[PDB]
């Protein structure tokens, strides 16, 4: 049983945090290898009995959207590459080619007639065309949530298994801008044996190369045993293009990119063109090329050398296939027949390279170092750190996380039944999974694509959201209607989703108001869904046409509720203030919903002509100089006014929060007797450099530390209710809201950077926590890694991805900020946290995009802020590279990422309505999640199969006694189980047939997958 992930510091050869603390970072001219040194080799190292085995691996990097849309690239480029690949590989048996992006391959394959399909299958079966990774895309590693990394891998690999009968075990990640250990975590659990990465900091490449530590067994930071390890190969040079893959001198290597001789437009920037290989020059050319290979081979431990051969959208023209193939074949024939070289070179695939390396390891020829850590933040040269894309296009970053939840919910809700083909459930789920998967591309969620490409991704994600809504609402109808009364029309809307936080108040008026009245419809059913495997209570809110509404459950038990006005903010260009207006026609009703594990609960809203017994009304206070009245229609309590002043609020037994006269948090007091702890929000802006390198979509190159946003005298709105209170303030570019429901506050920022060109807006938290230079940021929502601010690095290098959370702590106190969207952030001084909200850049940053970022739109960012006493917690030691959340902070993260879903019944009467679904579902331990529940079979299959992915996090022990909980056995969630198997995380390979058809729960920090089979 389980590894302790807290108290044992793993012993690794390279631990990236420790290596950063020691490493120099000096940007020194290394010669032809600009960022390295002049490599020397011993010519007698290789001989008749010990030859350098060189695998030249043709490839073509195909971005599913970047400068053109996916479909534009497919029509203009990729359909040709793949057509020509099919023809040339089929005609040339020794030619090889690897392919990464299954989205394009599936797009292609489904346009192929049978003859070509058969031909394609044959070049895959004979090993000439090899799929690497096999994901739908090559995902970003900074902003992506691990659940979506696994989704897009499963989408591509399930397609490959079904249509090509192959499952890749080698991964190829040549382009994401920095690399995360979440990848080997997911890959290793999905049957992978090896992986290749490229974009790591040039200083790290030089450091590892010096020690021949470019190939290593990459384990997770908390892994003491090393069972998570995956063999990784890091490429050594500046790019994956031909000039940077043959050896250390690009002026030489460029001469062996035969597409650069003129007729393809392309040329060599180092001024020496390739020349066709002939008998008159083959010897000289071979000398040149082998010398480059033998230099590159010096950086590695075995006698097996990987030479990628490709670049972006290569192998497009038939003439290009011929010019590369024929010229390399001429080199290989000469080189391999010249004993004096002691080289055997051939086209290969990636798996061939790794198979050969491991054969060399097994022969005792090499031992490999172990490594843990991550590879952020990347810089490709000088002080050009790629921390800009941790925030770029934040509207779509947030939309990613919204779609993530709705895909999970729709797959889970619809999994409980088998559906007739006419329902189109599988079709809709496939479309949603594929649009979300596509967006995980390293120019998708990263916000590094052209404006019109961003719009395409946005439209596709909008379609996905609608598809999820359709599936979820049909599922709810079926799950909550008496079976003998259930009468579906599969094109009808029984329920509409109500989402309070997307697109968000002030972003879009998309919420429907429930219209009730004594003379018309008196009442309305609403339904909440809880995707998490434990009972959950959460305040939910609805818009209603009257303030006089009562809430009941479906046993007619009253439910305590609170009504508040609907407040919207407007840039009142008449008075030149950002101020709130109250609705006179609709109101917000809020109540606590309690919902079963992975289940549903129905409530009823009912109108009355006066105040209901169990409904209370918020008070409202507008703090501003020179106030004017704010009428609220029928709302029964008048708004109060006041001059700006410090205020204090407390909901329930929860913390007391104090606010500045500018409506920004100043302090938090946890309990009535405890101290008021300074926690101050502030908004600042970064600018761009006037001379030298410009920030763009990719790069963050600030012109110095951020300067405070001048606030003036902003308007502050205070709402005080029994269930929920809030302070909102209209600041320049940001409506900032602090919401209190009785535990950790929620923060919402409506961010509209307007036409503030060349500006980045940051939210900072200033505390007196003595964190020093240490802080913690998450990786892909999966784990928290210790960061150390280094003064030897510039500010932008100390920015990291914040895909779900960050924290600082000292011996007694921790401040944790959870996010509902991936953004960039740091701790730039002891006691501070900061997180970038948006950025508007009018300049290109010279990484191939050819535009700045000037397509900003209002976005509602959501957060939770958790202040905790941690002197009693059992924490890792100072040398441990991980941190872990407390239970409160983990639940707060879950509240942002997987909130209850809300449905409003769309017609007047719901005949056969039921009160609950899932009351008998086990309520699992709080650290356990069912990350995926997906039915894997269509309704015609005699044996139905459902897949589950279980993930258990690790939470800090802080002395709260553990409650009794029920064991979750996913294999018994559906009736008539006939088998339970443990599988790889993609569901594609059976790993263990389970005794008694019981799926065991998993250890802390482990993730497992199970498939239950059912007789149907
Ligand atoms: C799929 O690949 C396997 C190798 O695991 C092979 O034995 C089998 O013949 C292939 N199945 C089909 C249907 O082609
Ligand atoms: O500079 C990074 C960009 C990537 O964003 C993109 O995905 C693409 O593959 C590419 N080719 C050349 C440059 N780039
Ligand atoms: Zn790319």
Description:
21% of the residues lie in helices and 29% in strands. The chain is an alpha+beta fold. It has 5 domains: 1-382, Glycoside hydrolase 38, N terminal domain (7-stranded beta/alpha barrel), CATH 3.20.110; 383-493, Substrate Binding Domain Of Dnak, Chain:A, Domain 2, CATH 1.20.1270.50; 494-618 and 899-920, Golgi alpha-mannosidase II (Immunoglobulin-like, Sandwich), CATH 2.60.40.1180; 619-898, Beta-galactosidase, Chain A, domain 5, CATH 2.70.98; 921-1016, Immunoglobulin-like (Sandwich), CATH 2.60.40. The strands form 9 sheets. A 12-stranded mixed β-sheet has the order 25-24-31-32-33-34-43-40-39-36-37-44. Strands 26, 27, 28, 29, 30, 35, 38, 41 and 42 form a 9-stranded antiparallel β-sheet that branches. Strands 14, 16, 18, 19, 22, 45 and 46 form a 7-stranded antiparallel β-sheet that branches. α12 packs antiparallel against α13 and α13 (425-439) runs antiparallel to α14 (451-479). The two termini are 36 Å apart. 54% of the residues are buried. Bound molecules: 2-acetamido-2-deoxy-beta-D-glucopyranose, ligand MVL and zinc ion. The site of the ligand OC[C@@H]1[C@@H](O)[C@H](O)[C@H](O)c2nccn21 has 10 residues, from loops. Belongs to the glycosyl hydrolase 38 family. It is a single-pass type II membrane protein.
**Could you describe the largest sheet, including whether it forms a barrel?**
12 strands, mixed
How many domain units? 5
**CATH topology (level 3) name of the largest domain:** 7-stranded beta/alpha barrel
User: What structural category arises from helix and sheet content?
Assistant: alpha+beta
Distinct ligands, ions and cofactors found in the model? 2-acetamido-2-deoxy-beta-D-glucopyranose, ligand MVL, zinc ion
The tally of strands reads 51
Radius of gyration: 30 Å
Our count of helices gives: 15
Q: Biggest sheet, strands in spatial order?
A: 25-24-31-32-33-34-43-40-39-36-37-44
CATH class of the largest domain: Alpha Beta
Helix content range: 10-25%
Q: Distance N terminus to C terminus?
A: 36 Å
CATH level-4 homologous superfamily of the largest domain: Glycoside hydrolase 38, N terminal domain
What is the correct CATH architecture of the largest domain? Alpha-Beta Barrel
Q: Please state roughly what percent of the residues sit in beta strands, choosing from under 5%, 5-15%, 15-25%, 25-35%, 35-45% or over 45%.
A: 25-35%
The coarse overall form would be globular
């Amino acid at each position: 049983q389980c590894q302790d992930v807290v108290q044992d510091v793993p012993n690794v050869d390279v631990q990236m945090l420790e290596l950063y603390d020691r490493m120099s970072f000096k940007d020194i001219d290394g010669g032809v290898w600009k960022q390295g040194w002049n490599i020397k080799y011993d010519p007698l190292k290789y001989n008749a009995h010990h030859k350098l085995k060189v695998f030249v691996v043709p490839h073509s990097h195909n971005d599913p959207g970047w400068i053109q849309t996916f479909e534009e690239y497919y029509q203009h480029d990729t359909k040709h590459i793949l057509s020509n690949a099919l023809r040339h590989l089929h005609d040339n048996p020794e030619m090889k080619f690897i392919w990464a992006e299954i989205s394009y391959f599936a797009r292609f394959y489904h346009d192929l007639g049978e003859n070509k399909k058969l031909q394609m299958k044959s070049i895959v079966k004979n090993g000439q065309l090899e799929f690497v990774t096999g994901g739908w895309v090559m995902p970003d590693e900074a902003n992506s949530h691990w659940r979506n990394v696994l989704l897009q891998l499963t989408e591509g690999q399930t397609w490959l298994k079904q249509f090509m009968n192959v499952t890749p075990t080698a991964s190829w990640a040549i382009d994401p801008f920095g690399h995360s250990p979440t990848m080997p975590y997911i890959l290793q659990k999905s049957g992978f044996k090896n992986m290749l990465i490229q974009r790591t900091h040039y200083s790290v490449k030089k450091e590892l190369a010096q020690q021949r530590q470019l190939e290593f067994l990459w384990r997770q930071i908390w892994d003491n045993k090393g069972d998570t390890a995956l063999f990784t190969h890091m490429m050594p040079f500046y790019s994956y293009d031909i000039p940077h893959t043959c050896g250390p001198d690009p002026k030489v290597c460029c001469q062996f990119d035969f597409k650069r001789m003129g007729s393809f437009g392309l040329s060599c920037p180092w001024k020496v063109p390739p020349r066709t290989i002939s008998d008159q020059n083959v010897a000289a050319r071979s000398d040149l090329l082998v010398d480059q290979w033998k230099k590159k081979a010096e950086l590695y431990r075995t006698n097996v050398l990987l030479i990628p051969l490709g670049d972006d959208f290569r192998f497009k023209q038939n003439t290009e296939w011929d010019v590369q193939r024929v010229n390399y074949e001429r080199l290989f024939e000469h080189i391999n027949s010249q004993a004096h070289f002691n080289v055997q070179a051939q086209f290969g695939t990636l798996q061939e390279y790794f198979d050969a390396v491991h054969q060399a390891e097994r022969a005792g020829q090499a031992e490999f170092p172990t490594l843990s850590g991550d590879f952020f933040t990347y810089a490709d040269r000088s002080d050009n750190y790629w921390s800009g894309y941790y925030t770029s296009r934040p509207y779509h970053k947030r939309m990613d996380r919204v779609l993530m939840h709705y895909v999970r919910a729709a797959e889970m809700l619809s999994a409980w039944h088998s559906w007739d083909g006419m329902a189109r459930i599988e079709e809709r789920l496939e479309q949603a999974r594929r649009e979300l998967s596509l967006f995980q591309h390293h120019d998708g969620i990263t916000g590094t694509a052209k404006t019109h490409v961003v719009v395409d991704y946005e439209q596709r994600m909008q379609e996905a959201l609608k598809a999820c809504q359709m599936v979820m609402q049909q599922s709810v109808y079926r799950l909550l209607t008496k079976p003998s009364i259930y009468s579906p029309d599969f094109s009808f809307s029984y329920f509409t989703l109500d989402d309070s936080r997307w697109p968000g108040s002030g972003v879009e008026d998309s919420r429907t108001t429930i219209i009730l009245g004594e003379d018309i419809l008196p009442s309305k059913h609403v339904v909440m869904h809880n995707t998490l495997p434990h009972w959950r209570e959460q305040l939910v809110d609805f818009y209603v046409s009257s303030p006089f509404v009562s809430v009941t459950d479906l046993a007619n038990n009253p439910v305590e509720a609170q009504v508040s006005p609907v407040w919207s903010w407007h840039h009142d260009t008449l008075t030149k203030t950002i101020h709130p207006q109250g609705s006179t026609t609709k109101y917000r009703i809020i109540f606590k919903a309690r919902v079963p594990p992975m289940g549903l609960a129905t409530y009823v809203l009912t109108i009355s002509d006066s105040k209901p017994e169990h409904t209370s009304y918020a008070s409202n206070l507008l703090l501003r100089k020179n106030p004017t009245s704010l009428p609220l229609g029928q709302y029964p309590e008048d708004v109060k006014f006041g001059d700006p002043r410090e205020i204090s609020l407390r909901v329930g037994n929860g913390p007391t929060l104090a606010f500045s006269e500018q409506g920004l948090l100043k302090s938090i007091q946890l309990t009535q007797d405890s101290p008021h702890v300074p926690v101050h929000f502030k908004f600042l802006k970064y600018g761009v450099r006037s001379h030298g390198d410009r920030s763009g979509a990719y790069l963050f190159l600030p012109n110095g530390p951020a300067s405070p946003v001048e606030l003036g005298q902003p308007v502050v709105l205070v709402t005080k209710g029994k269930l929920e209170s809030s302070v909102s303030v209209g600041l320049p570019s940001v409506v900032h809201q602090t919401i209190m429901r009785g535990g950790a506050p929620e923060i919402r920022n409506l961010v509209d950077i307007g036409s503030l060109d060349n500006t980045e807006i940051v939210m900072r938290l200033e505390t007196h926590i003595d964190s020093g230079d240490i802080f913690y940021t998450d990786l892909n929502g999966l784990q928290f890694i210790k960061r150390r601010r280094l003064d030897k690095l510039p500010l932008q290098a100390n920015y990291y991805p914040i895909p779900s959370g960050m924290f600082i702590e000292d011996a007694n106190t921790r401040l944790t900020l959870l996010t509902g969207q991936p953004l960039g952030g740091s701790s730039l001084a002891s006691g501070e946290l900061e997180i970038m909200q948006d950025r508007r850049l009018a300049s290109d940053d010279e990484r191939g995009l050819g535009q700045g970022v000037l397509d900003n739109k209002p976005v509602l960012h959501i957060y939770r802020l958790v202040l905790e006493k941690v002197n009693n917690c059992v924490r890792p030691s100072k040398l441990h590279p991980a941190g872990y959340l407390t239970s409160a902070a983990h639940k707060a993260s879950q509240s942002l990422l997987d909130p209850l879903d809300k449905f409003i019944f769309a017609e007047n009467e719901w005949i056969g309505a039921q009160g609950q679904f899932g009351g008998d579902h086990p309520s699992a331990r709080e650290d356990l999640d069912v990350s995926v529940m997906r039915r894997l079979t269509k309704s015609s299959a005699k044996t139905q199969r459902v897949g589950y992915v279980l993930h258990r996090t690790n939470l800090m022990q802080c002395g709260t006694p553990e409650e009794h909980t029920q064991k979750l056995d996913v294999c018994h969630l559906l009736p008539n189980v006939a088998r339970c198997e443990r599988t790889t995380l993609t569901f594609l390979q059976n790993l263990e047939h389970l005794d008694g058809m019981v799926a065991p729960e998993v250890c802390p920090m482990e993730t497992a997958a199970y498939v239950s089979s059912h007789s149907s």
